[PDB]
Design an enzyme around this catalytic site. Structure first.
Site, PDB file in Angstrom:
ATOM      1  N   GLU A 163       3.101  -7.010  10.715  1.00 16.26           N
ATOM      2  CA  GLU A 163       3.629  -8.110   9.918  1.00 16.26           C
ATOM      3  C   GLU A 163       4.968  -8.530  10.508  1.00 16.26           C
ATOM      4  O   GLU A 163       5.167  -9.679  10.865  1.00 16.26           O
ATOM      5  CB  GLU A 163       3.768  -7.684   8.464  1.00 16.26           C
ATOM      6  CG  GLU A 163       2.417  -7.288   7.820  1.00 16.26           C
ATOM      7  CD  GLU A 163       2.392  -7.605   6.361  1.00 16.26           C
ATOM      8  OE1 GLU A 163       3.217  -7.041   5.615  1.00 16.26           O
ATOM      9  OE2 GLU A 163       1.544  -8.415   5.963  1.00 16.26           O
ATOM     10  N   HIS A 181       3.744   0.785   5.863  1.00 17.34           N
ATOM     11  CA  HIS A 181       4.780   0.541   4.867  1.00 17.34           C
ATOM     12  C   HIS A 181       4.797   1.714   3.914  1.00 17.34           C
ATOM     13  O   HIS A 181       3.810   1.987   3.218  1.00 17.34           O
ATOM     14  CB  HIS A 181       4.542  -0.775   4.108  1.00 17.34           C
ATOM     15  CG  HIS A 181       4.624  -2.013   4.965  1.00 17.34           C
ATOM     16  ND1 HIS A 181       3.998  -3.194   4.626  1.00 17.34           N
ATOM     17  CD2 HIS A 181       5.285  -2.262   6.124  1.00 17.34           C
ATOM     18  CE1 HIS A 181       4.269  -4.112   5.535  1.00 17.34           C
ATOM     19  NE2 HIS A 181       5.031  -3.569   6.461  1.00 17.34           N
TER      20      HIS A 181
HETATM   21  C1  BL1 Z   1      -2.664  -3.391  -4.862  1.00 18.27           C
HETATM   22  C2  BL1 Z   1      -1.308  -4.004  -5.197  1.00 18.27           C
HETATM   23  C3  BL1 Z   1      -1.002  -3.803  -6.696  1.00 18.27           C
HETATM   24  C4  BL1 Z   1       0.218  -2.907  -6.691  1.00 18.27           C
HETATM   25  C5  BL1 Z   1       0.878  -2.386  -7.809  1.00 18.27           C
HETATM   26  C6  BL1 Z   1       1.992  -1.560  -7.569  1.00 18.27           C
HETATM   27  C7  BL1 Z   1       2.424  -1.276  -6.258  1.00 18.27           C
HETATM   28  C8  BL1 Z   1       1.736  -1.822  -5.162  1.00 18.27           C
HETATM   29  C9  BL1 Z   1       0.632  -2.644  -5.412  1.00 18.27           C
HETATM   30  N1  BL1 Z   1      -0.222  -3.296  -4.512  1.00 18.27           N
HETATM   31  N2  BL1 Z   1      -0.188  -3.299  -3.095  1.00 18.27           N
HETATM   32  C10 BL1 Z   1       0.669  -3.393  -2.062  1.00 18.27           C
HETATM   33  O1  BL1 Z   1       0.057  -3.334  -0.996  1.00 18.27           O
HETATM   34  C11 BL1 Z   1       2.196  -3.471  -1.938  1.00 18.27           C
HETATM   35  C12 BL1 Z   1       3.072  -3.124  -2.957  1.00 18.27           C
HETATM   36  C13 BL1 Z   1       4.447  -3.172  -2.723  1.00 18.27           C
HETATM   37  C14 BL1 Z   1       4.968  -3.575  -1.486  1.00 18.27           C
HETATM   38 CL1  BL1 Z   1       6.723  -3.622  -1.232  1.00 18.27          CL
HETATM   39  C15 BL1 Z   1       4.151  -3.921  -0.424  1.00 18.27           C
HETATM   40  S1  BL1 Z   1       4.762  -4.371   1.041  1.00 18.27           S
HETATM   41  N3  BL1 Z   1       3.649  -4.915   1.779  1.00 18.27           N
HETATM   42  O2  BL1 Z   1       5.967  -5.402   1.046  1.00 18.27           O
HETATM   43  O3  BL1 Z   1       5.250  -3.226   1.755  1.00 18.27           O
HETATM   44  C16 BL1 Z   1       2.766  -3.841  -0.690  1.00 18.27           C
HETATM   45 ZN    ZN Z   2       2.668  -3.750   3.303  1.00 16.73          ZN
END
Ligand code: BL1
Ligand code: ZN
Ligand code: HG
Length: 256
Positions: A103, A116
């Protein structure tokens, strides 16, 4: 609902999630020549010795290793961060081909994938309250390149079988995320957002400079995962990455 396809991908997210065009969106290109070495930045502290994994879920966009976060165990502090942040989950974004998937990009370079590790600020009580705050989250971004097997990833690689389709989860206890880190903790840091919907602008990003290497056979298995749920036309979980977004005045700082 949102995806990474022609009809629901990143170019469509702004309609349901207006902030997709906001002031501090992720990911961004890291221009290494424009980023400023910051001396006011304490060393990073990654403390994963007590980390307690619970399970791995196919969420229909990625797979999440989730952690027991009701005690202070796997914690991120130091560097750009004030106070303590608790590991909640980790996951990846990858491509269809070794030539894309990350990303964040580094002088426009797309790595094969990006990890991540998602942490939340303790002073806010829980994950759900943290994501309402501008300094609510810290995410440790780590780049993947294709070469030698990463030994400490293989346990994730083999459970992927259990969670091929959307919705499926598997018990995934006793996983050590320390296996997934490169030697050097040098990083870049900037204020940014979730890279998926809701795209909340609550993240301090900490993108490590030194990629980890994974093997071709390792990445390939990632690519056998499914976007669809069990019984549906098979869409293969590939290219689950948001492209680089406008920096917008923001400054990226180097820890080195
Ligand atoms: C499936 C959804 C629903 C959900 C709920 C709580 C935490 C993460 C989360 N999800 N997924 C993620 O991939 C996610 C969550 C937080 C972050 Cl800060 C990130 S990311 N891509 O900015 O690192 C991804
Ligand atoms: Zn992510
Ligand atoms: Hg926020």
């Amino acid at each position: 609902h949102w995806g990474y396809g022609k009809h629901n991908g990143p170019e469509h997210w702004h309609k349901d999630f207006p902030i997709a065009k906001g002031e501090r969106q992720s990911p961004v290109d890291i221009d290494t020549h424009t980023a400023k070495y910051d001396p006011s930045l304490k060393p990073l502290s990654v403390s994963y010795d007590q980390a307690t994994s619970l399970r791995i879920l196919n969420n229909g966009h990625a797979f999440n290793v989730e952690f027991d976060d009701s005690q202070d165990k796997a914690v991120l502090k130091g560097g750009p961060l004030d106070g303590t942040y608790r590991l909640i989950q980790f996951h990846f974004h990858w491509g269809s081909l070794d030539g894309q998937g990350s990303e964040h990009t580094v002088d426009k370079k797309k790595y094969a994938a990006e990890l991540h590790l998602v942490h939340w600020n303790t002073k806010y009580g829980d994950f759900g309250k943290a994501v309402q705050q501008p300094d609510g989250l810290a995410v440790l971004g780590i780049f993947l390149k294709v070469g030698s097997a990463k030994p400490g990833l293989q346990k994730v690689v083999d459970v992927l079988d259990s969670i091929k389709t959307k919705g499926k989860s598997a018990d995934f206890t006793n996983f050590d995320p320390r296996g997934l880190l490169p030697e050097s903790l040098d990083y870049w840091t900037y204020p940014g957002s979730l890279t998926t919907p809701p795209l909340l602008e609550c993240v301090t990003w900490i993108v490590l400079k030194e990629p980890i290497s994974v093997s071709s056979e390792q990445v390939l298995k990632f690519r056998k995962l499914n976007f669809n749920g069990e019984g549906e036309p098979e869409e293969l979980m590939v290219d689950n990455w948001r492209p680089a977004q406008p920096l917008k005045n923001r400054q990226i700082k180097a820890s080195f």
